[PDB]
Each structure stands twice: as C-alpha cells, then as structure tokens.
Amino acid sequence: GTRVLIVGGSLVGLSTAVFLAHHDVPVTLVERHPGTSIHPRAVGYYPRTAELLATVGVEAPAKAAASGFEKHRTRAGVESLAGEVLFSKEELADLTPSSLLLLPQDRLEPILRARAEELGAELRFGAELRSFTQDADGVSAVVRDADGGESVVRADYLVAADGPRSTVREALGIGREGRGVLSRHVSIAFGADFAAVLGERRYSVVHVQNDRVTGILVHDDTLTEGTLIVGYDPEKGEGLDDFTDARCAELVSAAIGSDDVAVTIRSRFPWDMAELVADAFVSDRVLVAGDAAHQIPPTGGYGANTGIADAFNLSWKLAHVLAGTAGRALLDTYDEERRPVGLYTARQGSLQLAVRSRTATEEQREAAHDAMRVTMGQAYPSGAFVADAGADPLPLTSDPRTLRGEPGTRAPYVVLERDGAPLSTLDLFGDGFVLLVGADGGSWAEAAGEAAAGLGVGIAFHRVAPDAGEGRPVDVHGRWAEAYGVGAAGAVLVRPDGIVAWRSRDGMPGGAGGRALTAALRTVLAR
Ligand SMILES: Cc1cc2nc3c(=O)[nH]c(=O)nc-3n(C[C@H](O)[C@H](O)[C@H](O)COP(=O)(O)OP(=O)(O)OC[C@H]3O[C@@H](n4cnc5c(N)ncnc54)[C@H](O)[C@@H]3O)c2cc1C
Ligand SMILES: COc1cc(=O)c2c(=O)c3c(c(=O)c=2c1=O)=C(O)[C@]1(O)c2c(cc4cc(C)oc(=O)c4c2O)CC[C@]1(O)C=3O
C-alpha cells in the first residue's frame, strides 16, 4: 500500500513528502505532534532553496506568505519591548530568478503540508514511530496513533526526518562527529497583542536583556503570535522541565515589559545550537535527512536550507529505485553527495556563529563563505553523475557565478522565451531527466529517444537556440552554450534535482550520441 515512510512532519519530512509525491511515490509520513509547530524556527530560505520549492509550486505561495514579514526590517536590543531600546539597525538577477524568502517555518510548513496532501501523500499527525526493523525486502515500523493504538507500517524505505535526537539514527548505530552542543535553549511560543506595545515599530528580531530574562524575541506579520528563545545553563542544574507554563508566562511577560498585555503560552520546545553530523546518511533501507543528519549552528539558517536540499536529492532517487529504472546503489549517492555538504555546511554554521558572536580568528573569517556559495555553489565530490575527462574537478563550493554546468553542479540559470512568455532552464528541470542541447545539436533528440527507450526512463529533450520556433525555448541573449560549458553542437543531461549528470562539449556523429548518453545515464542510474 505505502512505499516510502517518512518520520517527522517538520520541514524536511514534509519537503520529502512533497518531493516523493511530486514523483508519484506513495508516501506515508508520521509526526508524533498533532500538527506542524507554531514556532518560527528557521526564517530565511535562500534562492537555491526557493528554486527547489519552485519545482513543486511552493515558491509562489511562500513568497506571498512572506510579504507580510518583508516590512519587519529592524533588528534591536532592548530591556523589554515596552521598555528602553539599547540599539536598533535596518543573489541578483544574472544568477537566480529567486530571492531570499523571509518566511518562518510555521508558515512554510503548512504550505508544504497542503502541497503534499494535493499530490496524494498520506500525512498521519499525532502518530509516533516507536521502533522499526529492516530486512532485504523493506522496513517494518511500529506506529502508535493519538488514541494510543499501535500498527506495523510496511515500506520499501524509511526516511528519518525525526530531528536532532533522531531515535532512528540512534537505533541504526550511526554515530556523529562535530564540535557538539554549544548552548541549550527553549523556544516559548505565545499569543499577545504586539500592536499595543509595538505601535508603528516592526522588528525582524529583538534581543531582550533585563534582570529577569535574556533571550531572542520574534513577532509574526499579524502582531498576534510571538516567540521567546531563552538559554538555560546545565552547569547551574537548570533543565527543560524548569520551563513550566508559570515560568514561561513570567519570562514572556518580562520580555514584553507591560503587565497590561495578556499573554497565552501555546507551547515550549527545547532547541540546541550544535555542530553534530551523522557518520552515514544511508543505512541499507534507512535514509537520514535534516537535523537527524546535521545539526548546524543557526547563524545563517543553513540547517533548514541544507535539509530541504537533502529531501530534494534523495526524493527522485527513491522514485527511480522504486520504479526499477535505477539500481539500489543510486541511493548510496545521497550519502556521497549530501554528507560532505552536510559536514561542510555545519562547519560553515560554526564559522558564522563565531563571526556573529565577534569571537572569530582572521582564519575563521577567511574560511567563512557567502551564503550563496554555501547553498548554490555545490560541486558534489562524487555521486550520480559522470565527470568531464581532463577538466580539473571543482571544490565542494565555489562562487555560483563561476559554475558553467560541470557535472555534480546546479545546471545554470539561462533566461529563455516560449511564444513571447518568459522562462528559464530551471522551469525545464524538476520532473524527470532533461537533455538540453545547443543550436547545432538537433541530432541529440534521437540520442535522447534511444537512451529513454533503451533504459525505460523519460528524457525531456529541449534544444536551446537563439531564434524563435513556436513553442520552442528561445535563447534570448545567446548565453546557453557558454553558461553550460559546451559548444552549440553539445548536450547537457540534467537530473530531476537540476544537478548536471553528464555532458558532451561537442556533437556526436550518428549513433555515438545515443550510445554515449545511454552509458552516461546507465552509470548515473546504477545500471
Ligand atoms: C524550538 C526550535 C527552534 C529552532 N530555531 C531555529 C532557529 O532559530 N534557527 C535555525 O536555523 N534553526 C532553528 N531550528 C531548527 C530547524 O527547525 C531545523 O533545522 C529544520 O526544521 C530541519 O529539521 P528537520 O525538519 O529535519 O527536523 P526537526 O525540525 O527537528 O523536526 C523533527 C520532527 O520529527 C518528529 N519526530 C521525532 N521523533 C518522532 C517519532 N518517533 N515519530 C514521529 N515523529 C517524530 C518531531 O516531533 C519533529 O516534528 C529550531 C528548531 C526547534 C525545534
Ligand atoms: C552572539 O550573537 C548571536 C548568537 C546567536 O546564537 C544568534 C542566533 O542564534 C539567532 C539570531 C541572532 O541574531 C544570534 C546572535 O546575534 C537571529 O538573528 C535569528 O537568525 C533570526 C530569528 C528570527 C528572524 C525573523 C525574521 C523575519 O527575520 C530575521 O532576520 C530573523 C533572524 O535572523 C530567530 C533567531 C535566529 O534564527 C537565531 O537563531
């Protein structure tokens, strides 16, 4: 009945549901909580992440849900929101059609929830994975519902999106490396009349510091929902269980600094700033994604972004394995591609935490990469692609403006037109294998036909040429070939996740194009 089980219906579990259901994979997701968390959590989604979301219709609604917060331009440090202000302060179109999506997770998640439900994913909230076993043939998972009733869900594969304390990762005996837990915090979600204390003021985030509370205070677009994130010191013997609703009300009220503002605590969650990365992201039929794979220090919001990229990477791979078009070893490439990225990003988070706390060495500041290089400039060291002979390999990240369609990299953004209507290379990707070809590369259509037929996998052919053709992509400014690092007679095979899989810099005479592409694609699909 149900073929991929996801554990966790936070960001990554749901990005997984949307991506698997996009690819016509039967998904059951389980989330122990009765819905998606009202806490804001990770608030910035970088252009690359937005592009990923574009492929499943999530960018436009998320951009719409984000304009409410676009006004929230001011960062400040205060004694209390009602008290004294101590301090207050206030991509680009050749690379990406997307901008930074300033949207809290509690707004992005319901969008992903809706889209997953539309694409036919089964989402069981208030449902807890107790334990699981895996054999040669699949995975058997014990689910306890809200009523306390248990059942065994049978799946081909299990995706662990169950967060930092992932009982799956632990059940599998996958350890973790990194600098570990830096600080322990509690997120306190509450309802309050922010307007009555804000006036015309709108903040992104407020640092609160007075005798009774230190912490990070956020308000939503509506000025009704707020979060207070506070430290606790286990050296003082403080823990989570000290954050009783009494205690939570007292902190929030001292952060507001009013008394007259009625506060309703909705929930507190524990939240650690940590650098901890799984040794392995794949254990036979279990795929570890998200905070379960990589706790990342939150400065730059790399965690939530990395985890959606995890979900995007593994999703089509599972779809290809489940449909018998890819060898089971295709999934191993999830680990090969995303673990180095996971580990690199987690360390990037630590550099940023160090640069922001003003405790970085010039070496930490030297090694800290632009967020666009971290999220868009990735060159997978190895995985589901075929490298170019002779062309020197890329490091893990580069300036994404220097990338020219090297296999293992984001197939570049090239502005096109179809019947006068704007488009890009990116609009072409996300649904299946895409073969793109230059002006002189008309023969590569037969090439795509042969490989598609030979291997039983769809290959959407598009020639990119600088003069019209009704319903044909027009290379408006004649950039495609240069941008993809091929001649006008060349071809570039793009994976479902928009990563370049293979290319021919030159044309291939006769059947050679078809034989080569078949072998290229046979390798990427582990066949
Ligand atoms: C309170 C809090 C505040 C945060 N604040 C920030 C922030 O300010 N900045 C930032 O960059 N990141 C922040 N994060 C982290 C961010 O939310 C994650 O990086 C992002 O959501 C990716 O995590 P994930 O979806 O993989 O896992 P998580 O977000 O941890 O979600 C894991 C989910 O798995 C579920 N689960 C666990 N065990 C089971 C089980 N047995 N059965 C079913 N479901 C299970 C949990 O209930 C949870 O919903 C915060 C997280 C929390 C919890
Ligand atoms: C020592 O110095 C620090 C240490 C930290 O450990 C730290 C930290 O951990 C931070 C943080 C910090 O400033 C610091 C910080 O100074 C925030 O600034 C933060 O990014 C943030 C939040 C919400 C929003 C909402 C909106 C719309 O837009 C934002 O711009 C926005 C955010 O940007 C919620 C908290 C946040 O995610 C975060 O975790």
Numbering used by the authors: 5 to 94, 101 to 537
Question: Anything the authors wrote about it?
Answer:
Recently, two group A flavoprotein monooxygenases (FPMOs) (GrhO5 and GrhO6) and a flavoprotein oxidase (GrhO1) were shown to mediate the drastic remodeling of the 3 backbone and subsequent spiroketal pharmacophore formation. First, GrhO5 generates a ‐spiroketal moiety as part of the advanced intermediate dihydrolenticulone (4), which entails the rupture of three C−C bonds and a CO2 elimination step. The functional homolog RubL from rubromycin biosynthesis was shown to catalyze the same reaction sequence, pointing toward a universal strategy for spiroketal formation in the rubromycin family. In this work, the combined crystal structures of GrhO5 and RubL suggest three interconvertible catalytically relevant conformers, hereafter referred to as the “acceptor state” (FADox in OUT; accepts substrate, no reaction with NADPH), “reducible state” (FADox in OUT with bound substrate; reducible by NADPH) and the “catalytic state” (FADred in IN with bound substrate; reacts with O2 for hydroxylation).
To investigate the enzyme mechanism, GrhO5 crystals were soaked with 3. Gratifyingly, analysis of these crystals revealed clear electron density in the open, solvent‐exposed substrate‐binding site, consistent with the binding of 3 or 5 (possibly formed by X‐ray radiation induced reduction). In this conformation, the O1 and the O3 atoms were positioned in hydrogen‐bonding distance to the C4 carbonyl group and the N3 (only O1) of the isoalloxazine ring of FAD that retained the OUT conformation. This ternary complex (GrhO5, FAD, 3/5) represents the reducible state, in which the substrate is tightly coordinated by a cluster of basic amino acid side chains comprising H217, R79, and R366 that are in hydrogen‐bonding distance to O8/O10, O4/O5/O8/O9, and O4/O8 of 3/5, respectively. Interestingly, while the FAD conformation and active site residues were not affected by 3/5 binding, a distinct rotation of the conserved W281 side chain was observed that now adopts an intermediate position (with respect to its final position in the catalytic state, vide infra), while retaining the aromatic sandwich π‐π stacking with FAD. This is different from the type I members RebC and PieE, for which substrate soaking of the protein crystals induced the movement of the FAD cofactor to “IN” alongside the rotation of several amino acid side chains. Importantly, the novel snapshot of the GrhO5 reducible state shows that substrate binding first triggers a distinctive side chain motion of the corresponding W281 that enables the reaction with NADPH, while retaining the sandwich π‐π stacking interaction. Evidently, movement to IN did not occur in the soaked GrhO5 crystals, presumably because FAD unlocking also requires reduction to antiaromatic FADred in order to disrupt the sandwich π‐π stacking interaction with the flipped W281 side chain (consistent with the previously reported movement of artificially reduced FAD to IN in RebC crystals).
